[PDB]
């Protein structure tokens, strides 16, 4: 099973300046629950965004996509193509924009946290992938995060 | 990955008299999308409840649990224990009450449809398993079916 998991503003922005312009603890907890124990695949730019003290993310097989044959990611496996990372029962692609678009053909699940933040898209932003009509979505109820922003969870699925 | 999928009344009833006592087309489409392409595992009574012209379910590896050593199910593998049935990257246990209870200790996901009909538990009814604290799931919003029933979807998981 290949799944994608991400949080986006209502505009579709997922990242800016190489980081993320919000932080919802409830989203962090949902991310940990869904990914724990499984393979996580991230792009090199996303690995670079994690502080060394928190990486690799515990209890998961950390995999980083890079075109650099000598790039070293301490605590992770570095692979030059996405297909080499798909050897577990369950694989979660955790970002960022480039790797979501690369992995979408392999994916059957999309776990989306929509953040109710008014964040118009700007040049250089990373964006969530566009989901065509093959994806069936089940929407959650708008919830309040202790950070003060509302959020809702989406579960998209396709055979 | 071993998942369970079922549709229940609020009371927990999933079946009566060899039948499912409602019609909810959206749930069938949901069930078809989640199980398609994968192994599906079902108890002998649930196999017997499918008219011959509908079984085996298309596009899926149909497995039937029975204690009858010489039980044949044209179009399905017959196995004598749940563990025999579990094999692929992804297996869905699709009923009924006896098989759900047998399979829950091996499950990491439950996909539940709750049907808002006041269907009380009568003796002999097949029941959904009750999920404890260790099962976390986003409650879906209520929806309205073209059958006239209100329903909602839960996606439970445990790490
Ligand atoms: N849920 C959310 O909101 C999330 C947001 N983000 C955000 O996303 C942003 C980063 O995303 P983005 O900029 O798109 O970068 P990515 O994280 O997608 O990483 C891009 C890098 O991946 C490698 N790569 C890309 N395509 C290939 C390929 N075909 N083969 C091999 N390697 C490949 C390259 O590494 P190299 O240069 O080494 O070759 C490339 O530079 C950040 O702002 C981050 O904070 C991240 C994850 C989650
Ligand atoms: N989502 C829903 O609403 C669903 C509803 N249903 C309903 O559920 C009902 C059927 O459920 P239920 O009566 O509980 O029966 P099951 O479908 O669970 O089948 C029971 C049979 O499974 C076999 N079996 C049970 N335990 C084991 C074991 N440990 N090892 C091997 N084989 C075993 C036995 O077959 P044998 O006797 O041959 O040995 C037993 O009779 C029907 O009304 C059906 O419509 C069904 C599926 C889904
Ligand atoms: N829903 C969802 N999906 C995700 N892939 C991520 C990620 C990531 C990359 C490891 C950095 C997050 C997330 C965002 C901000 C803070 C904490 C988080 F877990 N949230
Ligand atoms: N959600 C969910 N889970 C399930 N296991 C099942 C089943 C089954 C056994 C094949 C009969 C259904 C379902 C219910 C009524 C009609 C069609 C359906 F697919 N729905
Ligand atoms: Co599937
Ligand atoms: Co899991």
Q: From which experimental method does this structure derive?
A: X-ray
Question: What is the Cα B141 distance to its own chain's centre?
Answer: 21
Structure tokens at A50: 């994690």
Q: Is residue B66 within 8 Å of B78, Cβ to Cβ?
A: yes
Residue A158 with chain B: CB contacts under 8 Å: 33
3-state secondary structure of B73: coil
DSSP state of B79: E
Which chain A residue's Cα is nearest to B158? A33
**Distance of residue B152 Cα from the nearest chain A Cα, in angstroms:** 10
Instruction: Give whole-number Cα distances, B19 to A98, B14, B84, in Å.
Output: 48, 9, 27
Cα–Cα nearest to B46, from B65, B32, B23? B65
Cα separation, A133 vs A137, in Å, equals: 10
Q: State the CB neighbour count (10 A cutoff) for residue B15.
A: 22
Cα separation, B117 vs B32, in Å, equals: 22
Query: Where does residue B100 rank: exposed (0-12), middle (13-18), buried (19+ CB within 10 A)?
Result: buried
Contact A153 B139 (CB under 8 A): no
Q: Is residue B27 within 8 Å of B113, Cβ to Cβ?
A: yes
Contact A138 B157 (CB under 8 A): no
Ligand with smallest separation from the Cα of B34: 5
CA torsion through residues A74, A77, A81, A86, sign: negative
Q: Looking at the DSSP assignment, which residues form a beta bridge with residue B15? A: B126
Report resolution in angstroms.
1.6
Residue with the smallest CA separation from ligand 3 atom 3 is: A6
Q: State the CB neighbour count (10 A cutoff) for residue A16.
A: 15
Residues 6 or more apart whose CB falls under 8 angstroms from that of B154 comprise: B110, B111, B112, B113, B114, B137, B138, B139, B140
Q: Is residue B122 within 8 Å of B22, Cβ to Cβ?
A: no
Cα separation, A138 vs B34, in Å, equals: 13
Q: Which domains are present in chain A?
A: 1-159 (3.40.430.10)
Cα separation, B94 vs B36, in Å, equals: 12
Cα–Cα nearest to A142, from A112, A110, A116? A116
């Amino acid at each position: 099973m290949v799944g994608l998991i991400w949080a986006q503003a209502t505009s579709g922005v997922i990242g800016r300046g190489g980081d993320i312009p919000w932080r919802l603890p409830e989203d962090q907890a949902h991310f940990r629950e869904i990914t724990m124990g499984h393979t996580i695949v991230m792009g090199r730019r996303t690995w670079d965004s994690l502080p060394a003290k928190v990486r690799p993310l515990p209890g998961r097989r950390n995999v980083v996509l890079s075109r650099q044959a000598d790039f070293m990611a301490s605590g992770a496996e570095v692979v030059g193509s996405l297909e080499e990372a798909l050897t577990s029962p369950e694989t979660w692609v955790i970002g960022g924009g480039q790797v979501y678009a690369l992995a979408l053909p392999y994916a059957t699940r999309c776990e989306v946290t929509e953040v109710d933040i008014g964040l118009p898209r700007e040049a250089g932003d990373a964006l969530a992938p566009v989901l065509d009509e093959t994806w069936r979505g089940e929407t959650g109820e708008w919830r309040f995060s202790r950070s003060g922003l509302r959020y809702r969870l989406y579960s998209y699925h396709r055979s």
